[PDB]
Amino acid sequence: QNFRVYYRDDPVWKGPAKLLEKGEGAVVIQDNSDIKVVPRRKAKIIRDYGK
Amino acid sequence: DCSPGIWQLDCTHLEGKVILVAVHVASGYIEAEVIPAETGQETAYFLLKLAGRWPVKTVHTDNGSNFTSTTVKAACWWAGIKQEFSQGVIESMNKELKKIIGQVRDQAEHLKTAVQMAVFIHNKKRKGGYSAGERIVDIIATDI
Amino acid sequence: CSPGIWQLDCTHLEGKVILVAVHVASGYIEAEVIPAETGQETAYFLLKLAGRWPVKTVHTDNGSNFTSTTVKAACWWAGIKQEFGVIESMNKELKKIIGQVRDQAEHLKTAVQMAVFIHNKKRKGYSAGERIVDIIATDIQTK
Amino acid sequence: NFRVYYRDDPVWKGPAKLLEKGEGAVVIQDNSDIKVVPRRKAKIIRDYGK
Ligand SMILES: Cc1ccc(C2CC2)c(-c2cc(F)c3c(c2C)CCCO3)c1[C@H](OC1CC1)C(=O)O
Ligand SMILES: Cc1ccc(C2CC2)c(-c2cc(F)c3c(c2C)CCCO3)c1[C@H](OC1CC1)C(=O)O
Ligand SMILES: [Cl-]
Ligand SMILES: [Mg+2]
Ligand SMILES: [Mg+2]
């Protein structure tokens, strides 16, 4: 059970990024070595459902 | 971690339209769709459908921008598919598919109809002596 | 015989038309969001289905897309016999899963294929995807 | 072996028996009637998957 985050800053989707924390309004992620705070609506948190 | 789960995907083109083709390398079985644009979104959607049908473990593609896109990464992550970027199989299959399409093209108005007739023809043809469509089902069931 | 028997039906979500095929003996499903509930779209779906599985008999209700000449043409070319509550149960199950995953995707069609994947891979002890492959391979291997 | 579907009315009619396929028109028989239909209004389909 692990997660990667795909997100938009630019309508192009970025990712995968590491999920650092999830809140009711935002997700904190690390893409490469930059930490970013991303509104929930602009992020998809996707698990490796199919293994 | 062997041949039952390994697929190759590539795009070919006819009549200005984009055809996305998947081949199960060990059987020669194929699936194809005419997609409206050669984008990550259309490729990811194709892959989710494919992964729901078969136990897709590895997909081998070239470096076309739709295959290296973020949207396809997301699809493979969710579905559990490893991407890798026996040799030249899909390129040979593209040619064979276009050959069959040309043989039946005048039997349908729409290119997509002839594409799917061609897929059917290829998958059902017994080489002896099983067909590609029989070979994939036999390979996967034995791997269960 | 059970290897070749399928049921097809349309269901509706978000004003979109979902065409569902169920392999009766396994519970395996495939589905597509089609732009209109027409014979042309139904026939194209059947041609794709018949190219991947040994489709011998298809059971449907009497919806006009299923009784259309275009679908009769598909079934004649592909060698399919047409007959006129497995699929209905399956429509409800598919919609339940779709509802559970709907906010994970922008597009309804994405959620539909996620739900198909979820349904087909779930081990209830084999999954529907394992069962269809096993049923059909047994028929092939025993001639 | 072959079926011809054809239009006159947007619904596809047939199947009819194929008698001759020309490049401009098709001669068919549908319920005792001999009909000549333009190629563009005809679909000639074989029971490939029998
Ligand atoms: C439009 C869009 C844009 C960006 C993405 C990805 C990078 C974030 C996706 C997408 C693609 C997936 F394959 C996928 C998922 C998503 C969310 C979720 C898990 C199952 O696999 C989609 C997706 O549509 C695409 C035709 C599939 C949608 O409907 O949201
Ligand atoms: C547009 C149209 C109109 C009428 C028909 C039928 C009554 C004559 C067909 C049709 C349907 C088939 F299922 C089919 C074939 C044809 C020709 C050829 C052999 C394999 O199966 C089509 C067909 O498109 C439909 C989405 C498939 C096309 O592209 O020509
Ligand atoms: Cl927050
Ligand atoms: Mg290529
Ligand atoms: Mg119905």
Swiss-Prot record, chain A:
Disulfide bonds: none annotated. Residues 3-48 bind DNA. It comes from the Viruses. It is found in: Virion; Host nucleus; Host cytoplasm. Homotetramer; may further associate as a homohexadecamer. Part of the pre-integration complex (PIC) which is composed of viral genome, matrix protein, Vpr and integrase. Interacts with human SMARCB1/INI1 and human PSIP1/LEDGF isoform 1. Interacts with human KPNA3; this interaction might play a role in nuclear import of the pre-integration complex. Interacts with human NUP153; this interaction might play a role in nuclear import of the pre-integration complex. Catalyzes viral DNA integration into the host chromosome, by performing a series of DNA cutting and joining reactions. This enzyme activity takes place after virion entry into a cell and reverse transcription of the RNA genome in dsDNA. The first step in the integration process is 3' processing. This step requires a complex comprising the viral genome, matrix protein, Vpr and integrase. This complex is called the pre-integration complex (PIC). The integrase protein removes 2 nucleotides from each 3' end of the viral DNA, leaving recessed CA OH's at the 3' ends. The core domain contains the D-x(n)-D-x(35)-E motif, named for the phylogenetically conserved glutamic acid and aspartic acid residues and the invariant 35 amino acid spacing between the second and third acidic residues. Each acidic residue of the D,D(35)E motif is independently essential for the 3'-processing and strand transfer activities of purified integrase protein. This is Integrase. It comes from Human immunodeficiency virus type 1 group M subtype B (isolate NY5) (HIV-1).
Curated annotation (Swiss-Prot), chain C:
It is found in: Virion; Host nucleus; Host cytoplasm. Residues 1-136 form the Integrase catalytic domain. Mg(2+) 3 binds at residues 9, 61, 88. The core domain contains the D-x(n)-D-x(35)-E motif, named for the phylogenetically conserved glutamic acid and aspartic acid residues and the invariant 35 amino acid spacing between the second and third acidic residues. Each acidic residue of the D,D(35)E motif is independently essential for the 3'-processing and strand transfer activities of purified integrase protein. Catalyzes viral DNA integration into the host chromosome, by performing a series of DNA cutting and joining reactions. This enzyme activity takes place after virion entry into a cell and reverse transcription of the RNA genome in dsDNA. The first step in the integration process is 3' processing. This step requires a complex comprising the viral genome, matrix protein, Vpr and integrase. This complex is called the pre-integration complex (PIC). The integrase protein removes 2 nucleotides from each 3' end of the viral DNA, leaving recessed CA OH's at the 3' ends. Homotetramer; may further associate as a homohexadecamer. Part of the pre-integration complex (PIC) which is composed of viral genome, matrix protein, Vpr and integrase. Interacts with human SMARCB1/INI1 and human PSIP1/LEDGF isoform 1. Interacts with human KPNA3; this interaction might play a role in nuclear import of the pre-integration complex. Interacts with human NUP153; this interaction might play a role in nuclear import of the pre-integration complex. This is Integrase.
